[PDB]
Symmetry: C2
Subunit: 187 residues, 2 copies
């Protein structure tokens, strides 16, 4: 029941490797990492590939861990109404035109954050339209499948299975094993 | 008394080479070209290294050939009062901040055009201050020595000699042989 240390020092075993391979095969992607806490995963993720010159467009009903992870990095944030896609397109166009505040230089990066199933409304995210806009305006997509993975779809693969979307147009997927698998951690 | 054709096809002789070397040695620079008309020189110069994304800051009393050469390329133009350097510094700072019109992206290039001696006032250009601002704000300098070369200075080298400025901080110099040398052409 004891671990040695961080995964980069002595912490890795063969079980971690097997779990990563199995998760990657299950989802439909190429590689994966597993962490010991979902909240920690969201909190410490965005800090790695975002700065104060990038921008994040997020739905107004996202989780708190995403908000803390965005706040720790320093990026700018704008939000759109829940379930409105015309507002999302208008906001994307206006923010590409305007540029960084006080300087109007081009945004170094743009990232769109959504949630597979919002666990206060029961509604889903319009994944096809998000992928369409993502393709058109050269943005990026980040999906949080905590309440979706394992429990929804014809075979339980999430929202990509539900919408028949190829799970390749979604840049980053993450979730937790706590909700439908009776365990702890995230990926 | 006859020429063959353009300099790039059959037009070059050894006399052109000797004249170019002699002019380059006389001025204090490394290389030079000679053209058959000063007006044509100014008209067709700027078209080679300027586009619609660069900017030109020129004095309000420049010659007409410079204006036509700038108009043919497509660059933007702003002017400053004659003999005012605080206005020049303020304009440089504001135009670096603002950026390209309608888009506010950074100016791809900035060029400052002046004249060694304005042949309607008899006044000189404040070359030391221009070189100072040029060094500080990373601009470029273009000087038109038509009435200055050959006729002014302790030995007749122009305004660089008058102001003891090293003729290396001035990016491009041009002039004519018509005014003080009793000939035709430009360099």
């Amino acid at each position: 029941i004891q671990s040695g240390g961080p995964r980069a020092q002595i912490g890795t075993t063969d079980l971690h490797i097997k779990a990563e391979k199995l998760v990657a095969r299950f989802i439909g992607k190429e590689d994966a990492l597993v962490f010991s806490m979902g909240y920690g995963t969201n909190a410490n993720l965005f800090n790695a590939f975002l700065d104060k010159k990038c921008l994040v467009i997020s739905d107004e009903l996202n989780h708190t861990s995403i908000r803390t992870g965005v706040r720790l990095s320093g990026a700018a944030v704008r939000t759109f109404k829940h379930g409105d896609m015309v507002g999302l397109e208008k906001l994307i166009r206006e923010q590409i035109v305007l540029g960084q505040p006080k300087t109007n230089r081009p945004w170094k990066k743009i990232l769109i954050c959504a949630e597979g199933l919002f666990s206060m409304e029961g509604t889903l995210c319009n994944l096809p339209k998000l992928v369409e806009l993502k393709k058109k305006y050269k943005c990026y997509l980040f999906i949080d499948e905590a309440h979706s993975i394992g429990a929804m779809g014809p075979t339980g693969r999430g929202v990509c299975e539900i919408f028949g979307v190829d799970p390749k147009d979604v840049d980053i997927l993450m979730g937790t094993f706590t909700k439908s698998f009776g365990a702890a951690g995230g990926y």
